[PDB]
């Protein structure tokens, strides 16, 4: 039993829920939060954006620290960092940006980083301004992430097709 609350199980391991991640990290105190980053790190805009804003700017300090000792992530890998005030820990996973013209492949790897945490707060990779279909980002989810799995869906338009296309 976990603390998740009013989410829809789609299969034996994923859940979904309209709502705003910061909104939910900061309520739930999940020990994952996963961000939707770019290999910089850089917490610009979309989900990242949000997440940062919601730590003051804590979770950008930190992450400029780590590329300067570290260099860039993979588009496909991720790296832990502190969840500051929304969670244990922010596992910041890179999906591919189609607006990059970067392979929509690399979304399996992006979301197997999942299983290495067994419950995981996390908005659909790819999906937003990092321009792929959140219907195709939920099905690779699905097919790919073994853990439990709690997606925030922050757009209830989108929630709702979502669901209803799910097979
Ligand atoms: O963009 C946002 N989320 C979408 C996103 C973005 C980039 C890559 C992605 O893969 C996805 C998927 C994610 C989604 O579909 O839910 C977002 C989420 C919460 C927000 N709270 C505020 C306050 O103003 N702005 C927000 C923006």
């Given at each position: 039993?976990?603390?998740?609350?009013?989410?829809?199980?789609?299969?034996?391991?994923?859940?979904?829920?309209?709502?705003?991640?910061?909104?939910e990290?900061?309520?739930?105190?999940?020990?994952?939060?996963?961000n939707?980053?770019?290999?910089?790190?850089?917490?610009?805009?979309?989900?990242?954006?949000?997440?940062?804003?919601?730590?003051?700017?804590?979770?950008?300090?930190?992450?400029?620290?780590?590329?300067?000792?570290?260099?860039?992530?993979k588009?496909?890998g991720?790296?832990?960092?502190?969840?500051?005030?929304?969670?244990?820990?922010?596992?910041?996973?890179?999906?591919?940006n189609?607006?990059?013209?970067?392979?929509?492949?690399?979304?399996?790897?992006?979301?197997?980083?999942?299983?290495?945490?067994?419950?995981?707060?996390?908005?659909?990779?790819?999906?937003?301004?990092?321009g792929?279909?959140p219907?195709?980002?939920?099905?690779?989810?699905?097919?790919?992430?073994?853990?439990?799995?709690?997606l925030?869906?922050?757009?209830?338009?989108?929630?709702?097709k979502?669901?209803?296309?799910?097979?």
């Amino acid at each position: 039993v976990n603390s998740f609350s009013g989410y829809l199980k789609l299969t034996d391991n994923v859940y979904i829920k309209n709502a705003d991640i910061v909104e939910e990290a900061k309520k739930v105190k999940p020990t994952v939060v996963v961000n939707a980053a770019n290999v910089y790190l850089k917490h610009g805009g979309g989900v990242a954006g949000a997440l940062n804003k919601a730590t003051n700017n804590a979770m950008q300090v930190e992450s400029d620290d780590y590329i300067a000792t570290n260099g860039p992530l993979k588009v496909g890998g991720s790296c832990v960092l502190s969840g500051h005030n929304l969670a244990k820990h922010c596992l910041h996973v890179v999906g591919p940006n189609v607006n990059k013209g970067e392979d929509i492949q690399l979304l399996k790897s992006a979301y197997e980083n999942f299983n290495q945490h067994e419950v995981l707060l996390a908005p659909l990779l790819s999906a937003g301004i990092f321009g792929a279909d959140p219907i195709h980002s939920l099905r690779v989810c699905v097919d790919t992430v073994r853990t439990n799995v709690y997606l925030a869906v922050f757009d209830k338009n989108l929630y709702d097709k979502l669901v209803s296309s799910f097979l």
